[PDB]
Amino acid sequence: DLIKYTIFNSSGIQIGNHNYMDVG
Amino acid sequence: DLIKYTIFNSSGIQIGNHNYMDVG
Amino acid sequence: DLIKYTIFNSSGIQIGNHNYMDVG
Amino acid sequence: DLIKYTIFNSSGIQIGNHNYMDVG
Amino acid sequence: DLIKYTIFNSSGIQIGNHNYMDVG
C-alpha cells in the first residue's frame, strides 16, 4: 500500500512487480 | 495506493507493474 | 490512487503499467 | 486518481498506461 | 504493506516481486 524508495547515484533500478529488465 | 520514489542521478529506471524494458 | 515521483538527472524512465520500452 | 511527477533533465520518459515507446 | 529502501552508490538494484534482471 505504501512504497517509498530513496536511491542516490545508481543504474539498472528494477523496483516493480513482475518486471523484466536486462542490462548489457 | 501510495507510491513515492526519490532517485537522483541514475539510468534505466524501471518502476512499474508488468513492465518490459531492456538496456543495451 | 496516489502516484508521486521525484527523479533528477536520469534516462530511460519507465514508470507506468503494462508499458514496453527498450533502450538501445 | 492522483498522478504527480517531477522529473528534471531526462529523456525517454514513459509514464503512462499500456504505452509502447522504444528509444534508439 | 510498507516498503522502505535507502541505497547510496550502487548498481543492478533488483528490489521487486517476481522480477527478472540480468547484469552483463
Of B4, B11, B14, nearest to A16 by CB-CB distance is B14
Q: What is the DSSP letter of A15?
A: -
Q: Give the distance from CA C9 to its chain's centroid.
A: 13
What's the rounded Cα separation, in Å, for the pair C17 and E11?
Answer: 24
Total CB pairs under 8 A between chain A and E: 83
| Beta bridge pairs of residue E4 | A4
Q: Residue B12: how many CB atoms within 10 A of its CB?
A: 27
Q: What is the spatial distance between Cα C8 and Cα C17, in angstroms, rounded to a whole number?
A: 21
- Grid coordinates representing D23 are 528509444
Name chain B contacts of A9, Cβ cutoff 8 Å: 8-10
Q: Within a 10 A sphere around the Cβ of E17, how many other Cβ atoms?
A: 10
Length reported for chain C: 24
C-alpha cell at D14: 514513459
d(CA C4, CA D3) in angstroms, rounded, equals 7
Nearest Cα residue to C16 out of D14, D12, E18: D14
Cβ–Cβ < 8 Å for A7, B7:
yes
Spatial separation of the C-alpha atoms in residues E20 and E14, rounded to whole Å: 8
Judge residue A10's burial from the number of C-beta atoms within 10 Å of its C-beta, 0-12 exposed, 13-18 middle, 19 or more buried.
buried
Give the C-alpha separation, A12 to D3, whole Å: 24
Q: What type of residue is A11?
A: S
